Design a binder for these strands. Structure first.
Ligand SMILES: Nc1nc2c(ncn2[C@@H]2O[C@H](COP(=O)(O)OP(=O)(O)NP(=O)(O)O)[C@@H](O)[C@H]2O)c(=O)[nH]1
Ligand SMILES: N[C@@H](Cc1ccccc1)C(=O)O
Ligand SMILES: [Mg+2]
Ligand SMILES: [Mg+2]
Ligand SMILES: [Mg+2]
Ligand SMILES: [Mg+2]
Ligand SMILES: [Mg+2]
Ligand SMILES: [Mg+2]
Ligand SMILES: [Mg+2]
Ligand SMILES: [Mg+2]
Ligand SMILES: [Mg+2]
Ligand SMILES: [Mg+2]
Ligand SMILES: [Mg+2]
Ligand SMILES: [Mg+2]
Ligand SMILES: [Mg+2]
Ligand SMILES: [Mg+2]
Ligand SMILES: [Mg+2]
Ligand SMILES: [Mg+2]
Ligand SMILES: [Mg+2]
Ligand SMILES: [Mg+2]
Ligand SMILES: [Mg+2]
Ligand SMILES: [Mg+2]
Ligand SMILES: [Mg+2]
Ligand SMILES: [Mg+2]
Ligand SMILES: [Mg+2]
Ligand SMILES: [Mg+2]
Ligand SMILES: [Mg+2]
Ligand SMILES: [Mg+2]
Ligand SMILES: [Mg+2]
Ligand SMILES: [Mg+2]
Ligand SMILES: [Mg+2]
Ligand SMILES: [Mg+2]
Ligand SMILES: [Mg+2]
Ligand SMILES: [Mg+2]
Ligand SMILES: [Mg+2]
Ligand SMILES: [Mg+2]
Ligand SMILES: [Mg+2]
Ligand SMILES: [Mg+2]
Ligand SMILES: [Mg+2]
Ligand SMILES: [Mg+2]
Ligand SMILES: [Mg+2]
Ligand SMILES: [Mg+2]
Ligand SMILES: [Mg+2]
Ligand SMILES: [Mg+2]
Ligand SMILES: [Mg+2]
Ligand SMILES: [Mg+2]
Ligand SMILES: [Mg+2]
Ligand SMILES: [Mg+2]
Ligand SMILES: [Mg+2]
Ligand SMILES: [Mg+2]
Ligand SMILES: [Mg+2]
Ligand SMILES: [Mg+2]
Ligand SMILES: [Mg+2]
Ligand SMILES: [Mg+2]
Ligand SMILES: [Mg+2]
Ligand SMILES: [Mg+2]
Ligand SMILES: [Mg+2]
Ligand SMILES: [Mg+2]
Ligand SMILES: [Mg+2]
Ligand SMILES: [Mg+2]
Ligand SMILES: [Mg+2]
Ligand SMILES: [Mg+2]
Ligand SMILES: [Mg+2]
Ligand SMILES: [Mg+2]
Ligand SMILES: [Mg+2]
Ligand SMILES: [Mg+2]
Ligand SMILES: [Mg+2]
Ligand SMILES: [Mg+2]
Ligand SMILES: [Mg+2]
Ligand SMILES: [Mg+2]
Ligand SMILES: [Mg+2]
Ligand SMILES: [Mg+2]
Ligand SMILES: [Mg+2]
Ligand SMILES: [Mg+2]
Ligand SMILES: [Mg+2]
Ligand SMILES: [Mg+2]
Ligand SMILES: [Mg+2]
Ligand SMILES: [Mg+2]
Ligand SMILES: [Mg+2]
Ligand SMILES: [Mg+2]
Ligand SMILES: [Mg+2]
Ligand SMILES: [Mg+2]
Ligand SMILES: [Mg+2]
Ligand SMILES: [Mg+2]
Ligand SMILES: [Mg+2]
Ligand SMILES: [Mg+2]
Ligand SMILES: [Mg+2]
Ligand SMILES: [Mg+2]
Ligand SMILES: [Mg+2]
Ligand SMILES: [Mg+2]
Ligand SMILES: [Mg+2]
Ligand SMILES: [Mg+2]
Ligand SMILES: [Mg+2]
Ligand SMILES: [Mg+2]
Ligand SMILES: [Mg+2]
Ligand SMILES: [Mg+2]
Ligand SMILES: [Mg+2]
Ligand SMILES: [Mg+2]
Ligand SMILES: [Mg+2]
Ligand SMILES: [Mg+2]
Ligand SMILES: [Mg+2]
Ligand SMILES: [Mg+2]
Ligand SMILES: [Mg+2]
Ligand SMILES: [Mg+2]
Ligand SMILES: [Mg+2]
Ligand SMILES: [Mg+2]
Ligand SMILES: [Mg+2]
Ligand SMILES: [Mg+2]
Ligand SMILES: [Mg+2]
Ligand SMILES: [Mg+2]
Ligand SMILES: [Mg+2]
Ligand SMILES: [Mg+2]
Ligand SMILES: [Mg+2]
Ligand SMILES: [Mg+2]
Ligand SMILES: [Mg+2]
Ligand SMILES: [Mg+2]
Ligand SMILES: [Mg+2]
Ligand SMILES: [Mg+2]
Ligand SMILES: [Mg+2]
Ligand SMILES: [Mg+2]
Ligand SMILES: [Mg+2]
Ligand SMILES: [Mg+2]
Ligand SMILES: [Mg+2]
Ligand SMILES: [Mg+2]
Ligand SMILES: [Mg+2]
Ligand SMILES: [Mg+2]
Ligand SMILES: [Mg+2]
Ligand SMILES: [Mg+2]
Ligand SMILES: [Mg+2]
Ligand SMILES: [Mg+2]
Ligand SMILES: [Mg+2]
Ligand SMILES: [Mg+2]
Ligand SMILES: [Mg+2]
Ligand SMILES: [Mg+2]
Ligand SMILES: [Mg+2]
Ligand SMILES: [Mg+2]
Ligand SMILES: [Mg+2]
Ligand SMILES: [Mg+2]
Ligand SMILES: [Mg+2]
Ligand SMILES: [Mg+2]
Ligand SMILES: [Mg+2]
Ligand SMILES: [Mg+2]
Ligand SMILES: [Mg+2]
Ligand SMILES: [Mg+2]
Ligand SMILES: [Mg+2]
Ligand SMILES: [Mg+2]
Ligand SMILES: [Mg+2]
Lengths: 393, 60, 205, 82, 85
RNA sequence: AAAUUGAAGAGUUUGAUCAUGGCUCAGAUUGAACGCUGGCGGCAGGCCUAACACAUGCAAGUCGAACGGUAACAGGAAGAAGCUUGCUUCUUUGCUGACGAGUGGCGGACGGGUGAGUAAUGUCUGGGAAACUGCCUGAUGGAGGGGGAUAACUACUGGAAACGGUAGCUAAUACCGCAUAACGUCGCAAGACCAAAGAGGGGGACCUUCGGGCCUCUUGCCAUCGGAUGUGCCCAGAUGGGAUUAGCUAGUAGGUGGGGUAACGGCUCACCUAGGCGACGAUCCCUAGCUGGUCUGAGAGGAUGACCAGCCACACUGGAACUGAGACACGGUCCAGACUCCUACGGGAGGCAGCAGUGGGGAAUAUUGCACAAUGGGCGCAAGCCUGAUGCAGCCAUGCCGCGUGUAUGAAGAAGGCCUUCGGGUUGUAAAGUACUUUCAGCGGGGAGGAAGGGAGUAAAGUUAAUACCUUUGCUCAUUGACGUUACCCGCAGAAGAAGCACCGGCUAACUCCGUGCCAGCAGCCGCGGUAAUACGGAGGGUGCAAGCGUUAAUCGGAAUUACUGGGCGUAAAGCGCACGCAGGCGGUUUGUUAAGUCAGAUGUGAAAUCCCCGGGCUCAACCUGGGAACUGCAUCUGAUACUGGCAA
RNA sequence: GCCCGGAUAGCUCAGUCGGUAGAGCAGGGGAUUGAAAAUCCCCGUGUCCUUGGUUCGAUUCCGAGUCCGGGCACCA
């Protein structure tokens, strides 16, 4: 909080995806040290990508850590997702804001059960583009074995509905590029080139009014309570009226400073992760899931009609019917929420792999409008995608 | 202290943080306070129209 | 700030004619006056000692269009002023601009006079005044501004003032909409029906 | 050092200055020996505008008291023969 | 500290180096008189009194000592010389 | 001419009564909070609890007219070198203006903040001598002639930093002698002794050794005696609660002598005496800043001491002194401590009870805004720079006060609701409908008043050898607003954008119908509900307030329920079981005689604000404001002698 | 942000390792009374915290949640 962030180069939200203990967080650390050395950005280290007691005694990552590496063309903003099956909830918030992912499959183990689950969540939420990275390579010195894994990833993406063969696969060790090997340093400089070439300039919405889903809340010692997240649409000027909408009720507020990776800003534009400082609000009363909207634009609702597309055994979801009373998790912009289902008159049961509409009464009210996309989940797996039809409350 | 819970029906149980104002009940000997309906975890009375500042209920 | 409800309802509860909806026509005969305050209008009231005081206060309030906070402040001024506390209460009420504008005959009703004062029409001693509560001092000259002079509402309302008693304490030109407030109003000049003594009783306790 | 200076009373945007004989170390509005007239800049042409008791000024300025920049101007405003 | 007028710290420390020495000098010349007093006639004591008289008066004029301090160190000290001897 | 015009009761013990006596209510009021509902403006206010711990920026600097600096920086002048000979390179010049870093001056001790401590060291009222007092200001009269240092700057090192050391060197209003000194300082006096600093703006004449000297004039220094303003100290009375705290006390209480204090003093010592305080409450304990005031009251009183003003106290906790005119020093210093801190592990920091802001505590209380434009404050000849003092702005119905939320006509007495003896009533001129406004918001143009000054010039005065320079000035110039898309004025537009929430059994203004059946619930007091509830829940209808309304808490009132004004004690609560009796309270009657009480007068004071009355100024009000009265007092001074006291018969 | 416990008819508790849950204390219906209480004669009055899954069948076995309990961290 001192240096002013100069608005140059387009902003892009990137993040690593993949199996547990597969080189996902280590890739993030490899991208910093490579890009910082040659081009001349800020250095950083593997340290702080994940500190705490939880991510040291174990070694695993829980929190979605962020990184800011810069290149001549564009200014990237990383989102290193956790990895585990148990940490899928806080991952989806990191994955929703992420524009273009970096998948991490390993040459030794290959595509594992979570790799299938992570890419499954990427499609239904909103991950337009994806890039593969083989994160072991050196451990198995062979030409035939390493190339057989590349075939299975191309099959995985094409089976689950992506381009597959068009996606640029890259090979390279993360640990070898951490130190200073000339052949392996240049091979991850190549990944930065694939990030620029494949993923296009993202289409923002700098016209329709201000909205910002809160991914994680903070309490800065001195300044006040702060909320982070990607600005979904519109802009934010300093000293402007902002209404916080979502869970509990609704509160008036005013912005008193927006920032971008510990650097000041005047205008917080759309499609970029920013930390908004709020005036006269406590850490407890504001929570994760709520949205920073401009007053009057959006209203919180606890009941709505919605066209739900349930999945089958083949697509990956439920395989049995269910009657009114069923309570799955509904993942809107960031947070999840439970709700009872009231089916329409003339529909006795809901079979798997079927398009229908239904009334859903949620326990917590969330801010929503007509034409909002969500992904239903229940029992550590997906259920179905859909869209909102009508407001009731 | 003991505190009386006014209105018909309540959400109070086991714990739940509530607000207390003064006022005896004059019936339960020992009870000498009233819970404020509306404030904190104590919600408003369900389906009330007349006298709703007392009992913490919003407009219809 | 104002009543803005059923105005002729107030007259039936009080019983007597309050001049709220006096207007163009002289006598109403269109409400069942006296014997229908509300649903239970046929109910003959017992009417206690506090009742008759409250009914008398509420009558004088509703005639002059004043609320309890502002009305109780007139009593506090009336007590500190010299002479009789009762005579001062009503003398200060009659000194209001919205009341003087009604008594001059630039308004069929007192609410119409209040709106006329409030909407930049009324002017006194070469100065525009918006406040209905404006205490009109002795020896003044209230009048209408030339932009809003001889508009449709004032000319018809001035013809009504010929049927009225017309006060002695003030004088009106009638040609060029120009008034002249001269002296302070006496007790015996006006009303001779609304009791002051009972209103002094209500506030003293 | 005793000094003759303005006190600044009155409402917001509606100043009224009590010219007053006070010690330099004491605050503007605070302690004084004795007040010696007043000044009103938002008075305009009417009955009253500025008053300044010149008899008490001889007791202080004659002995040893400075006159502030604004109060020195009001002694010129009231005049000796104008 | 958070000010540029900490010159006063180094100035007041520089003052008392000087200020203590001249004070120390004075109170030794006064001790010189009390040393002479006790076992001595009016001769050795009054010689020491004539030596300190200019020193105490001078330091009184410079603001180290106050003029009444100086006044007493003549007044009470002459009363020792006059009464005893 | 005006300064108080002021004193209300009701419900509730009983089958009923009168009394006693509690309980509760009607009114004012607030730093408020909460619930529901929320349009504007104006003026006020807005961490009472954790004196909790707090990142970040900022709250005190200033002068070149003190001084070295021929300057860290940016720029003119004598001269230089390149070459597009005025375009460029560039050494000298206090020399262009100034000023980073110093050295000295004055400031930092004021201005802000907070009530932790403090029951008397404090505060209040009235007195009183033993005092000091920078800046300001009266008077007198000096200010003469010398020295040795010393930073900065180098030079050379140490250190991670903070911050040093060693070798030079140099300036002064820094520093110290010396002469020089009195109505000054000690003394019986004779005597002795004690100081100073120089600057800046101009010059004819003549010395030029050019650094000019000498006239010049503002300025500054220094000694005394003074005023002014502060401040230190002393006394008297007053200033909370507890006796289920009755004895405390050894520098304790006084003396003589010495030291010390700006000043007197057990302030502090040495010895001497054996006190001193105490029932008119010492000591100990708990609580507490104090006052002007505030709220309340018919007044006496009771409660309270947020905001404005005076005094005190305190500054991370516990100490000490240094500097100074002033501090035992909020943003100095030094230790010690607890807690945060950074490091190269040697050592360093740090102090929001300045302004914003954070966490935490809490029922609860705000912007890391703009500005020195004004008003004071700081230095300075000034210009100016500095200023979270102040002035604005934000926020919050937290209050007090203003205007809103339309205004006439309108019978088919419509619909719909609600009630009914189904005839009709009522909601209700309510609505719709037609006639009109256009305040306030919403827009577009106009646009004050807060601004006095400071300059650039001038004109005569001042001042002098001078038609100079400063002191005073009157005339001509161009300017100075954070507020600010200002106050206020017009210009459209269309009723358009603008109403709730208590209550409705008695006290207490206002009633029916359904639902429920001592259940669910209400309740300020009495009390409502057991299948026909006016008290519960809803509905309609009413009543009372209205951008507020209620609930909660808090103080006084009513409470003559701590009674001094103004109560009681046979039986309601209440005469010790009965005596004696010291201290204490009270005391027959006549003369004196003082004057303590008492009374009368007079003078000083009782800060300003506040209150009160007559005015005045904001469109009105709240708000601001002139004068008056008042400040019920306390002191002294002069009388009066009836009464009370003292004192003699 | 993530670990862990807690919930069984109106209240206080038993019961389970898939075999379909009970006890007291309440409550209700009739008799009686103005209504009760006792007296007399009859009744569990249940979303096993919610929801899905493994199965013929889940309180019971395995996920996902609810609100609440206590625990460890992150400083745009
Ligand atoms: N030899 C080698 N080892 C690697 C390479 N990349 C990753 N690893 C190893 O893989 C392990 C996983 O590290 P990390 O990336 O933090 O795990 P993750 O992929 O983020 N998943 P999660 O954080 O949920 O546990 C580490 O022990 C690391 O040494 C590589 O290129 N070469
Ligand atoms: N926009 C943020 C992203 C972030 C969120 C939370 C933790 C760290 C980073 C930056 O900083
Ligand atoms: Mg493995
Ligand atoms: Mg990881
Ligand atoms: Mg492991
Ligand atoms: Mg493996
Ligand atoms: Mg109002
Ligand atoms: Mg109407
Ligand atoms: Mg009264
Ligand atoms: Mg003071
Ligand atoms: Mg003026
Ligand atoms: Mg230091
Ligand atoms: Mg010595
Ligand atoms: Mg000195
Ligand atoms: Mg009574
Ligand atoms: Mg009574
Ligand atoms: Mg009875
Ligand atoms: Mg009786
Ligand atoms: Mg509030
Ligand atoms: Mg509230
Ligand atoms: Mg204001
Ligand atoms: Mg406090
Ligand atoms: Mg403390
Ligand atoms: Mg503290
Ligand atoms: Mg820091
Ligand atoms: Mg700090
Ligand atoms: Mg500053
Ligand atoms: Mg100079
Ligand atoms: Mg010079
Ligand atoms: Mg101070
Ligand atoms: Mg102070
Ligand atoms: Mg203050
Ligand atoms: Mg105080
Ligand atoms: Mg005194
Ligand atoms: Mg000084
Ligand atoms: Mg002086
Ligand atoms: Mg002189
Ligand atoms: Mg010399
Ligand atoms: Mg020498
Ligand atoms: Mg030397
Ligand atoms: Mg030397
Ligand atoms: Mg020298
Ligand atoms: Mg000196
Ligand atoms: Mg000296
Ligand atoms: Mg000599
Ligand atoms: Mg000499
Ligand atoms: Mg003498
Ligand atoms: Mg002599
Ligand atoms: Mg002599
Ligand atoms: Mg000298
Ligand atoms: Mg010179
Ligand atoms: Mg010359
Ligand atoms: Mg002179
Ligand atoms: Mg001088
Ligand atoms: Mg001077
Ligand atoms: Mg001087
Ligand atoms: Mg002197
Ligand atoms: Mg003097
Ligand atoms: Mg002194
Ligand atoms: Mg003493
Ligand atoms: Mg009063
Ligand atoms: Mg009163
Ligand atoms: Mg009374
Ligand atoms: Mg008190
Ligand atoms: Mg305070
Ligand atoms: Mg304030
Ligand atoms: Mg203040
Ligand atoms: Mg004092
Ligand atoms: Mg004192
Ligand atoms: Mg102290
Ligand atoms: Mg102090
Ligand atoms: Mg402090
Ligand atoms: Mg300190
Ligand atoms: Mg200290
Ligand atoms: Mg201390
Ligand atoms: Mg000293
Ligand atoms: Mg000095
Ligand atoms: Mg001192
Ligand atoms: Mg200080
Ligand atoms: Mg501080
Ligand atoms: Mg330290
Ligand atoms: Mg603060
Ligand atoms: Mg806070
Ligand atoms: Mg400026
Ligand atoms: Mg100033
Ligand atoms: Mg000065
Ligand atoms: Mg001068
Ligand atoms: Mg000038
Ligand atoms: Mg100035
Ligand atoms: Mg400033
Ligand atoms: Mg301030
Ligand atoms: Mg308001
Ligand atoms: Mg408001
Ligand atoms: Mg509120
Ligand atoms: Mg209509
Ligand atoms: Mg019109
Ligand atoms: Mg307007
Ligand atoms: Mg406009
Ligand atoms: Mg001017
Ligand atoms: Mg102006
Ligand atoms: Mg001028
Ligand atoms: Mg100025
Ligand atoms: Mg000039
Ligand atoms: Mg000039
Ligand atoms: Mg001139
Ligand atoms: Mg303008
Ligand atoms: Mg207008
Ligand atoms: Mg119009
Ligand atoms: Mg119209
Ligand atoms: Mg029109
Ligand atoms: Mg309306
Ligand atoms: Mg029952
Ligand atoms: Mg009945
Ligand atoms: Mg009924
Ligand atoms: Mg009711
Ligand atoms: Mg109603
Ligand atoms: Mg209220
Ligand atoms: Mg009371
Ligand atoms: Mg009383
Ligand atoms: Mg009595
Ligand atoms: Mg009695
Ligand atoms: Mg008895
Ligand atoms: Mg008895
Ligand atoms: Mg007895
Ligand atoms: Mg007896
Ligand atoms: Mg007794
Ligand atoms: Mg006796
Ligand atoms: Mg006697
Ligand atoms: Mg007698
Ligand atoms: Mg007698
Ligand atoms: Mg006599
Ligand atoms: Mg006497
Ligand atoms: Mg007396
Ligand atoms: Mg007297
Ligand atoms: Mg006064
Ligand atoms: Mg007045
Ligand atoms: Mg006026
Ligand atoms: Mg007026
Ligand atoms: Mg006032
Ligand atoms: Mg006044
Ligand atoms: Mg006055
Ligand atoms: Mg007087
Ligand atoms: Mg006689
Ligand atoms: Mg006699
Ligand atoms: Mg006698
Ligand atoms: Mg039964
Ligand atoms: Mg039973």
């Amino acid at each position: 909080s001192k240096e002013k962030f100069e608005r140059t180069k387009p902003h892009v939200n990137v993040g690593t995806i993949g199996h547990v203990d597969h080189g996902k967080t280590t890739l993030t650390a490899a991208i910093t040290t490579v890009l910082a050395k040659t081009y001349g950005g800020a250095a950083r280290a593997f340290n702080q990508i994940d500190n705490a007691p939880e991510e040291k005694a174990r070694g695993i990552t829980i929190n979605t850590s962020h990184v800011e590496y810069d290149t001549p063309t564009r200014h990237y903003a990383h989102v290193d997702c956790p990895g585990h099956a148990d940490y899928v909830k806080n991952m989806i918030t990191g994955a929703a804001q992420m524009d273009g992912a970096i998948l991490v499959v390993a040459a030794t183990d290959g595509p594992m059960p979570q790799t299938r689950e992570h890419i499954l969540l990427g499609r239904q939420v909103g991950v337009p583009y994806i890039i593969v990275f083989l994160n072991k390579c050196d451990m198995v010195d062979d030409e035939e074995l390493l190339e057989l894994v590349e075939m299975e990833v191309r099959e995985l993406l094409s089976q689950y509905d992506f381009p597959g063969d068009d996606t640029p696969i890259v090979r390279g060790s993360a640990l070898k590029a951490l130190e200073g090997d000339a052949e392996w340093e240049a091979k991850i400089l190549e990944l930065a080139g694939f990030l620029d070439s494949y993923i296009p300039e993202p289409e923002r919405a700098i016209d329709k009014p201000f909205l910002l889903p809160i991914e994680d809340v903070f309490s800065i010692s001195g300044r006040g309570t702060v909320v982070t997240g990607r600005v979904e649409r519109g802009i934010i000027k300093v000293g402007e009226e902002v209404e916080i909408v979502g869970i509990k009720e609704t509160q008036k507020s005013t912005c008193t400073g927006v920032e971008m990776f510990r650097k000041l800003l005047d205008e917080g534009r759309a499609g970029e992760n920013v930390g908004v400082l709020l005036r006269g609000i406590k850490r407890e009363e504001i929570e994760r899931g709520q949205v920073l909207a401009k007053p009057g634009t959006i209203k919180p609702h606890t009941k709505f009609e919605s066209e739900v597309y349930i999945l089958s055994k083949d697509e990956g979801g439920r395989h049995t019917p269910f009657f009114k009373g069923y309570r799955p998790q509904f993942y809107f912009r960031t947070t999840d929420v439970t709700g009872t289902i009231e089916l329409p008159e003339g529909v006795e049961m809901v079979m798997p792999g079927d398009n229908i509409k239904m009334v859903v009464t949620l326990i917590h009210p969330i801010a929503m409008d007509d034409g909002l996309r969500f992904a239903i989940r229940e029992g550590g797996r997906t259920v179905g995608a859909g869209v909102v039809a009508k407001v009731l409350s | 202290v003991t505190s009386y819970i006014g209105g018909e029906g309540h959400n109070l149980q086991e714990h739940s943080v509530i607000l207390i104002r003064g006022g005896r009940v004059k019936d339960l000997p020992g009870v000498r306070y009233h819970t404020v309906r509306g404030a904190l975890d104590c919600s408003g009375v369900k389906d009330r129209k007349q006298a709703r500042s007392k009992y913490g209920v919003k407009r219809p | 700030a104002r009543y803005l409800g059923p105005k002729l309802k107030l007259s039936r509860r009080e019983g007597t004619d309050l001049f709220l909806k006096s207007g163009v026509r002289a006598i109403d005969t269109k409400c069942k006056i006296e014997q229908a305050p509300g649903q239970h209008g046929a109910r003959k009231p017992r009417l206690s000692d506090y009742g008759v005081q409250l009914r008398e206060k509420q009558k004088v309030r509703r005639i002059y269009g004043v609320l309890e906070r502002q009305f109780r402040n007139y009593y506090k001024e009336a007590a500190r002023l010299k002479g009789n506390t009762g005579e001062n209460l009503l003398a200060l009420l009659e000194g209001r601009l919205d009341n003087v504008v009604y008594r001059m005959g630039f308004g069929a009703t007192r609410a119409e006079a209040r709106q006329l004062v409030s909407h930049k029409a009324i002017m006194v001693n070469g100065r525009v005044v918006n406040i209905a509560s404006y205490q009109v001092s002795p020896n003044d000259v209230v009048s209408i501004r030339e932009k809003a002079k001889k508009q449709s509402r004032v000319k018809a309302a001035l013809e009504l003032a010929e049927q009225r008693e017309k006060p002695t304490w003030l004088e009106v030109d009638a040609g060029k909409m120009e008034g002249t407030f001269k002296r302070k109003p006496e007790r015996s000049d006006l009303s001779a029906d609304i009791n002051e003594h009972l209103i002094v009783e209500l506030y003293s306790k | 050092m005793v000094t003759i200076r303005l006190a600044r009373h009155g409402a917001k945007k509606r100043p009224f200055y009590q010219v007053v004989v006070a010690d330099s170390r004491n605050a503007r509005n605070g302690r004084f020996i004795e007040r010696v007239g007043f000044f009103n800049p938002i008075a305009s042409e009417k009955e009253e505008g500025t008053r300044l008791d010149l008899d008490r000024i001889a007791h202080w300025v004659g002995q040893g008291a400075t006159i502030s920049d604004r109060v020195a101007a009001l002694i010129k405003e009231v005049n000796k023969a104008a | 500290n958070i000010k540029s007028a900490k010159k006063r710290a180094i100035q007041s420390e520089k003052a008392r180096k000087h200020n203590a020495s001249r004070r120390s000098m004075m109170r030794t010349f006064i001790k010189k008189v009390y040393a002479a007093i006790e076992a001595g006639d009016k001769a050795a004591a009054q010689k020491a009194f004539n030596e300190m008289q200019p020193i105490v008066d001078r330091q009184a004029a410079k603001g180290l000592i106050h003029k009444n301090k100086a006044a007493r160190h003549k007044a009470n000290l002459t009363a020792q010389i006059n009464k005893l001897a």
